Amino acid sequence: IATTSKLDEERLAFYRTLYRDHARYGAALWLVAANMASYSDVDALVEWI
Amino acid sequence: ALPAAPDSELIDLVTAELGADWPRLVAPVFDPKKAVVFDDRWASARED
Amino acid sequence: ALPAAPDSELIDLVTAELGADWPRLVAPVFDPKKAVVFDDRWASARED
Numbered sequence: 001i002a003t004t005s006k007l008d009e010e011r012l013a014f015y016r017t018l019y020r021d022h023a024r025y026g027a028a029l030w031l032v033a034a035n036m037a038s039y040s041d042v043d044a045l046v047e048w049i
Numbered sequence: 050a051l052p053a054a055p056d057s058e059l060i061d062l063v064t065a066e067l068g069a070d071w072p073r074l075v076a077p078v079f080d081p082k083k084a085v086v087f088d089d090r091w092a093s094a095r096e097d
Numbered sequence: 098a099l100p101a102a103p104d105s106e107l108i109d110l111v112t113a114e115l116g117a118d119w120p121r122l123v124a125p126v127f128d129p130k131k132a133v134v135f136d137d138r139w140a141s142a143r144e145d
Contacts, residue, residue: 038079039114053104072110
């Protein structure tokens with residue numbers, strides 16, 4: 001369950017290719033845009049996970 | 050101008066103590082409905 | 098209500114990121130007119 005600064009087309013394509021290139025067994029790549037310099041986003045991220 | 054003055058001082062000491070780019074560098078972006086899942090391996094396996 | 102909305106926003110992110118006591122804990126108190134000098138030793142010497 002990886003986070004990123006912003007979710008746009010380029011990162012979407014990069015992460016899609018990353019999963020489809022490296023995935024195995026029952027792998028699942030969750031992904032959400034969050035700010036690591038914001039305590040509110042950290043709290044939202046932990047309560048979302 | 051009654052609350053704009055103390056708010057102006059708030060902005061001033063935020064700029065002096067932290068910086069003028071603190072709201073940008075700190076603003077939240079998280080939204081639970083903008084998450085994406087990528088757990089479709091079987092279709093990728095067939096295409097591969 | 099137009100600037101009170103972003104001002105309130107800034108209040109809430111300084112509350113969540115730093116705290117509700119940040120303005121008090123950080124507010125400046127310096128004033129050059131309130132300095133005090135204590136270089137009178139001769140009079141103290143005579144009284145001693």
